[PDB]
Amino acid sequence: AIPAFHPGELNVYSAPGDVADVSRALRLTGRRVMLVPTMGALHEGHLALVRAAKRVPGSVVVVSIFVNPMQFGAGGDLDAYPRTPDDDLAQLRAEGVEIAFTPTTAAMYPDGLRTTVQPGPLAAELEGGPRPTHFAGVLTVVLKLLQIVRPDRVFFGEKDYQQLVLIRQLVADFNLDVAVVGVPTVREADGLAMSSRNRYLDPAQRAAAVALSAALTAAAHAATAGAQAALDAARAVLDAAPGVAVDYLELRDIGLGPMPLNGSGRLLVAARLGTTRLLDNIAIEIG
Amino acid sequence: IPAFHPGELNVYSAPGDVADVSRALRLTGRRVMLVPTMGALHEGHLALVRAAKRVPGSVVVVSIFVNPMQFGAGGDLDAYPRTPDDDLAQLRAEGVEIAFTPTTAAMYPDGLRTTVQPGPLAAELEGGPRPTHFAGVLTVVLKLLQIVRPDRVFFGEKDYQQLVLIRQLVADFNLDVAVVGVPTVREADGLAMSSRNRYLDPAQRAAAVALSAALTAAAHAATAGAQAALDAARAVLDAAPGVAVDYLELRDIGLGPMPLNGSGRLLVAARLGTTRLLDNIAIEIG
Ligand SMILES: CC(C)(CO)[C@@H](O)C(=O)OP(=O)(O)OC[C@H]1O[C@@H](n2cnc3c(N)ncnc32)[C@H](O)[C@@H]1O
Ligand SMILES: CC(C)(CO)[C@@H](O)C(=O)OP(=O)(O)OC[C@H]1O[C@@H](n2cnc3c(N)ncnc32)[C@H](O)[C@@H]1O
């Protein structure tokens, strides 16, 4: 028997088998299953993905909420990760979402870490520098969510651009039959990319943090003058801010391969303000 | 959808073609059965085909692909037997409707990029001296499963460690497919059928009966305990001319981090000249 599903209401399932059964039953009834993977503690950045999924005609939106231990580091603080279950579900209800998948760690990893996904070399670069096992954790849990839910489309934010690219690699490499949809980064009024981490910044740091987005947008417009001008413009803006320790500032092609001297690319930056690591990236057209 | 002639063998090399045909079939109620092979088909493979064909309303897809990723350099990939024409003739005689024969470029357009990392079992037994072998096997099987999306996938008990690792892959990645293990097909004297038996000269072929004789002796000696079972197999293997044992181990059936307790699997690997043969058998202790 298929678990109960009440249309127009937020239906919450914790068991993988239950959401798999409902999802399959719904796809047979004329719905297109949209999957929005998250780790909860939802904000407007996450809701933008929700809205993108909801607009697809015939959509039934599945939002997964699961703090994935595998992507935290030997030094990542899993226990400290924000958990606001009640408020998250309230936001999903307000958004018209019909399915929330909230599994336990034991349900996702009943046999602990055994078979896992090993990403390509891109996983060791950029964010993979300080967190070399992070993306293996992300790809492993995303592959599982994709097999459990079997969505028609899965949504990821351009906020985590390297994550998005690695998911496209996972999908191509494993011949997965799902469409990956990237959603533009939601930003605060001054341009700061929305993140739960922004609240950790003190006033001086919050003002200095504007430099990441301002450096990227400056570079995007300086790009008519070439790659080097775009990079130098971005560095100049970051250099005008106090207490911003840049970990990297790199211009790559859109698939994160070598910096192009012409055409489309992506400029990515990561920096530390006190103990808070912030990231941002932007589309760049060279020339 | 590419052309599909029911009741005849349809051969597709493009992943997209077999994926489209499989999907269309599943949408019309047929249940898709997948039998992965590396070709050089013999009766062992045909038992998997027949197991698949007996499932009601089934359409059988046999993949034939000598997967480069599961070979370690050293001429092994080039030395693997290839008998394309006989393989397809056999599939036709069995009434198989789909043969999926992809190219290396279609399967690995980006070389080795995202891959499957198996659990610890992959570093043991067959994996001990071939550390990347099972990552190669699990990566290609995961791809084949995503391309064909079968309701059930068939594997022989002959490669028992491989079968166990595939069950781990399916459970660990929440794959919606049933894994069916098929009993080992043997020659009249007990020799497990293998595409590698063709490399045994007459003398070696005669001596090779020792692996199955040792295992079956052990299975019956086991009423007297594990030590009795293992010593009986060792005696048979030691009486065999020209058989060099690589390993002979008795494990819990999951081959996992669990001690042997009642139901086990006895596995053996041995070399006759340059030919490495494997065999295994279910064992019940006491
Ligand atoms: C994929 C996960 C769920 C795997 O555990 C995990 O790695 C994860 O990323 O979770 P999480 O941090 O919860 O983010 C979930 C999704 O929301 C997107 N997102 C976050 N802030 C955003 C913003 N300001 N604008 C647009 N999109 C934004 C992320 O890029 C990601 O696709
Ligand atoms: C899974 C593959 C296709 C991935 O490349 C590859 O690793 C592979 O295993 O190829 P291959 O050697 O072609 O074996 C294909 C399948 O037939 C089974 N098989 C072989 N000899 C058998 C016998 N005598 N009785 C019963 N089943 C037998 C194997 O265990 C395996 O599942």
For residue B114, give the nearest of A139, A147, A177 by CB distance.
A139
**Hey, are the CB atoms on B146 and A174 less than 8 Å from each other?**
yes
Token couple for A141: 């849990």
3-state secondary structure at position A276:
strand
Ligand nearest to the Cα of B161, by number: 2
User: Can you tell me the distance from the alpha carbon of A117 to that of A139, in angstroms, rounded to the nearest whole number?
Assistant: 6
CB-CB contact of B181 with B71 (8 Å)? no
Q: What is the C-alpha radius of gyration for chain A, rounded to an integer number of angstroms? A: 20
Neighbour-count burial for B52-83, b at 16+ CB within 10 Å, e otherwise: bbebeebbbbbbbbbbebbbeeeeeeeebeee
Residue in the structure block whose two tokens are 């780790």: A39
Q: Is B149 on the interface with A (CB under 8 A)?
A: yes
Q: Burial level of B3, CB count in 10 A (0-12/13-18/19+)? A: exposed
* Residues framing ligand 2 (Cβ under 6 A): B 36-38, 44-45, 47-48, 67, 70, 137, 140-141, 155-156, 158-159, 162, 182, 184-185, 192-195
Under 8 Å between Cβ of A202 and A256: no
For residue A147 the two structure tokens come to: 């097999």
CB atoms within 10 A of CB B206: 16
Q: Is B185 left (phi over 0), alpha (psi -120 to 50) or beta?
A: beta
B45 labelled catalytic: yes
Tokens of B106: 């279609």
How many CB atoms lie under 10 A from the CB of residue B19? 18
Q: Whose CA is nearest to atom 27 of ligand 1?
A: A157
Question: Can you tell me the distance from the alpha carbon of A270 to that of A215, in angstroms, rounded to the nearest whole number?
Answer: 12
User: How far apart are the C-alpha atoms of A60 and B44, rounded to whole Å?
Assistant: 45
Q: B42, B43, B159: which to mutate for ligand 2, most atoms within 8 A of CB?
A: B159
Ligand in nearest proximity to the CA of A145: 1
CA–CA gap between residue A129 and residue A246 (Å, rounded): 13
| Separation between Cα atoms, residue A248 and residue A258, nearest integer Å | 15
Ligand 1 site residues (CB inside 6 A) read A 37-39, 45-46, 48-49, 68, 71, 138, 141-142, 156-157, 159-160, 163, 183, 185-186, 193-195
> What approach was used to elucidate this structure?
X-ray
Tokens of A72: 């935290």
Phi, psi of A113 (to 5 degrees): -90, 110
B142 by Cβ neighbours in 10 Å (0-12 / 13-18 / 19+) ranks as: buried
Confirm or deny that B156 is annotated as ligand binding: yes
Identity of the residue in B15, B114, B174 whose CB atom sits nearest the CB atom of A147: B174
Q: Which residues of A146-182 are buried (b: 16+ CB within 10 A; e: fewer)?
A: bbbbbbbbbbbbbbbbbbbbbbebbbebbbbebebbb
DSSP code at position B190: S
Name the residue with the closest Cα to ligand 2, atom 16: B37
CA of B236 to the centre of ligand 2 (A): 26
Q: Which ligand is nearest to the CA of A48?
A: 1
DSSP code at position A225? G
> Mind listing the domains of chain B with CATH numbers?
1-183 (3.40.50.620), 184-286 (3.30.1300.10)
CA B92 to chain centre: 21
| Matching residue, tokens 């499963």 | B145
Tell me if A191 sits within 8 A of A210, measured CB to CB.
yes
Quote the tokens at residue A104.
Answer: 């336990």
- State the Cα–Cα distance between residues A121 and A66, nearest whole angstrom: 26
DSSP per residue, B4-36: --TTS-EEE-SHHHHHHHHHHHHHTTPEEEEEE
Per the DSSP assignment, residues forming a β-bridge with B57 are: none
Known binding residue A43? Answer is: yes
Identify the DSSP state of B213. H
Judge contact between A45 and A194, C-beta under 8 A: yes
Residue carrying the six token digits 């789909």:
B98
B75: its two tokens = 């001429």
Token pair of A133 as six digits: 């096992």
Nearest to B44 by CA among B171, B160, B158, B209: B158
Tell me which of A35, A36, A38, A161 to substitute to probe ligand 1's pocket, judged by most ligand atoms within 8 Å of the beta carbon: A38
